[PDB]
Amino acid sequence: LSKGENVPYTFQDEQVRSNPYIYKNHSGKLVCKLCNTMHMSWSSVERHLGGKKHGLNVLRRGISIEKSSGSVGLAIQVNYSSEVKENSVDSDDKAKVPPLIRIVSGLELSDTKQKGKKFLVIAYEPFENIAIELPPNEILFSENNDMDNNNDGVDELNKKCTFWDAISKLYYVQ
Amino acid sequence: SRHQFDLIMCLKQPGVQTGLLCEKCDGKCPICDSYVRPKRKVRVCENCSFGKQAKNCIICNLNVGVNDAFYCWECCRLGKDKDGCPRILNLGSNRLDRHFEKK
């Protein structure tokens, strides 16, 4: 009935769940943490999920989440796969989207130890992100390079100074 | 009794005569039905003694009684000892429904 899935106890301090709600409390019985309902058997649970009140609680949680949350310059040459693994994924899912760059402040890190400098992060869907430290307060930060044409793409940075050789898979940034 | 609600006790002034329990109900407090540590003898009112009904067990009031019935220590501590005559009167729904269920 359970489809062989292990439903962890409430106290086990979280393998991804199917429905991330139904638990077993400190006692034996089954619980739905949204609706705060106690169910005796897994069939009653499947009737709860197929019930109307659980849907209402899921939507109310949806709204509850959606309301809150002449100089010197640098040039980088990033190379990508040679049709080695990209042969299994070609379903026009952002495949047309080129790599993207953003300047991030080190004030926020997974470890939060030291900080105080910027990073020129570069990202592509499958591959892993990449960063480059920029101690200099400003370099190559130009002044109206082109003649003010407005296709924002992502931002002034990307259109202003990036090139994506998609035929060879080479991303240049300067 | 404790477990069966439809039963009705007597609760009159206990007389000088001791109640009796059948071999089946033997060794049980008439109040809480506790098999352990007895304390005192039960005593039943005149209107619960008289004739043959005196010989019956004071709990099931069907089988004949043999041993004296005792109040457990706790029912003597709580004082439910001295309430009155602890003789069940009606037989209850359980026993009757058994009798007619079998035949």
Binding site: - | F5, G51, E74, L78, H99, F100
Partner: protein, 816 residues
Amino acid sequence: LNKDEKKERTLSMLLLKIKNGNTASRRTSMRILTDKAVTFGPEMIFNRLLPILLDRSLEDQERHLMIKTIDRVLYQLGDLTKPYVHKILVVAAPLLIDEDPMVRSTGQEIITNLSTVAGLKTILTVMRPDIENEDEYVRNVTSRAAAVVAKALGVNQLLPFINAACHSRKSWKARHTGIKIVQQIGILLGIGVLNHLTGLMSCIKDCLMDDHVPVRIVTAHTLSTLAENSYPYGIEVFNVVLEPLWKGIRSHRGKVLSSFLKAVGSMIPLMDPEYAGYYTTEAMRIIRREFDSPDDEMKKTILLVLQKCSAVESITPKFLREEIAPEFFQKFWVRRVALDRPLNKVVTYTTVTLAKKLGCSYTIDKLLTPLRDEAEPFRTMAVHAVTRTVNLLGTADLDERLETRLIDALLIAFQEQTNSDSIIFKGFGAVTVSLDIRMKPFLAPIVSTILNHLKHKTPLVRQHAADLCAILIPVIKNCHEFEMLNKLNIILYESLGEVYPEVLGSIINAMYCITSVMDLDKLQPPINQILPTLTPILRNKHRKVEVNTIKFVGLIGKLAPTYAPPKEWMRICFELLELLKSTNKEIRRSANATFGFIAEAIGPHDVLVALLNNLKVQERQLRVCTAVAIGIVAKVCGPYNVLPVIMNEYTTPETNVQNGVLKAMSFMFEYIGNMSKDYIYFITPLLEDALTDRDLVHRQTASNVITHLALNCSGTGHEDAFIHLMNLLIPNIFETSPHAIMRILEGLEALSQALGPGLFMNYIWAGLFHPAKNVRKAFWRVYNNMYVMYQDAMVPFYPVTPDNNEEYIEELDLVL
């Protein structure tokens, strides 16, 4: 219509379900009726329900189901019109005469409830046209019905009705049944007639003098029932009726003289010693004159008058032996007596009551010739008399010769018996137990007969053979022959493999009586070989085999723990833990009792793991009995061993294991009465989580721990843990369901004696009045229980100041 015709459909569907329906169906429909009975019209409820009970096709099963519904509706609605009163009396009234006392009682509860419901005035208006009825059956019924109403509402309120019917010159049957009402009133009230007997006597006396005989007889029986039910007191009243009984005895003879001798005979023991001698001697002449009466009634009365007159001090035992006794034994012991039981009971009991005045050796002396008679059912009665007589008088009177002939006849009549009866066992045993030391020269052949009877092909004679050993074993020890104990024990242990269970259980019982008596080391088989042959017997199923086997194994556990190796004991434990699924009770109680013996024998921790492994089973009997087993282990081997293991076991997430842990803790607390004090302190954080938990079962069961803990831990000086426990309990007062609320209330009452009345009251006085009609309804109950436990103990503790109440008490403010 179509909306209310749906109700007319609902009642029909329900009543159908109760009468003919599934168990879980009728069980719920009963609830639906009881809760919905007020919203259905009693016109419709009874108007629909009553026509079913009239037809002849209904079985007793289907009839009692309708009866129960009638009772549950009557006890609720509380007010009823007279036509339905008459109908319900038409249906329920026939039950009082029914063949078995169960139907009698359940038909009696109806009328005793309706008497309160329908009130006094209505039922009497229903009976008045009924007593005048020409029918015999109806009058017979509503005599009993009228008496049930009389006890139900009290007799004085219904008394002038009886006086009217009895004294009525209009109709004769009205006098007749109006007198019978006094009969069944005398029967139901028991000794409690007493004070009312004078008022009742207003009826009987004049109603005795009617020209018609069948009334004169009924009055005579009423005087007998009132005379016996009264007992010695009632004399002062019957003096008025005592005179005409004699002018009636000396003349009317026939069937009436039987009734009047019943009356006077029942009047004797309540008479003064002066009169008793006279009236007895007057009665004895008529008795002797009437010995030859072929009528069963008259013989039954003669046995009554002889039955009573023996108690009179005036007549001497010599007078009885010289005259009355020989005329008694020869006439009333004729073999034609032994055939019909109701007269057998009276003859035997009469002989027994004569045994008091007569010499024991004289009574037994006259009872040896019937024992040696050839007729089997006659020898049986001759046994009954000897049994009860020996039970009263003992054997001290018997000379050696009668002591020989008696036991000879008991051996003979013992060996040819047919029906299964204990009367020999007890009786032949009652002889042995009394004269036991004097039994020795007779003991050798007796045992031999048993040793023959065990080899008999019929199963009954084997039962009866084995049973008589278990009675002799104690007197065989007194006769000192141990070689016969060993020879028996060996022969039984060899016969222990019998096919028939009913005999095998008795065999094991004899084994038990042998083992308890005899020296353990001198047992031949011996025990160490005995037990491994017993362990396969526990799986024999049935019952008696299981019961006797378990009690015997427990006897070994007490006396001989060290013989069987502990692994074999563990085999025993694994068989018992499976065995207690048995439906019977004493099987389970004995099993649980044996776990203490084994845990004492081998060790606690090897048994406890096995028990705790069994709490995961779904069935309730298994879990509860393993809880009791853990309790007994904790008692016998000490709580400090079991308590940490159980408290660890309570950590499991499963519900049933936790509830089982709490219950086992309840039992292990009520089993150790005083100890209990050192151990609290640990278990309050365990009760902490139990009293907190969501479901209503933990809060229930944990309070039961608090009862047994607080009762016998009170006054020890802890009292700071019981305040904690109470602080956790009080919010549960508002909880519904019967089971949790009674356990919680008991918990608060036990905590009252741990905290004291005042320290406990400080919580209650607040909402003791309160606006809410519910909090009030809840707290007045706890105040009721506290008031019953304590009256003068709460007096300093009331919240009363001179301006709080009007009068107060001026003297509580005085100081010297």
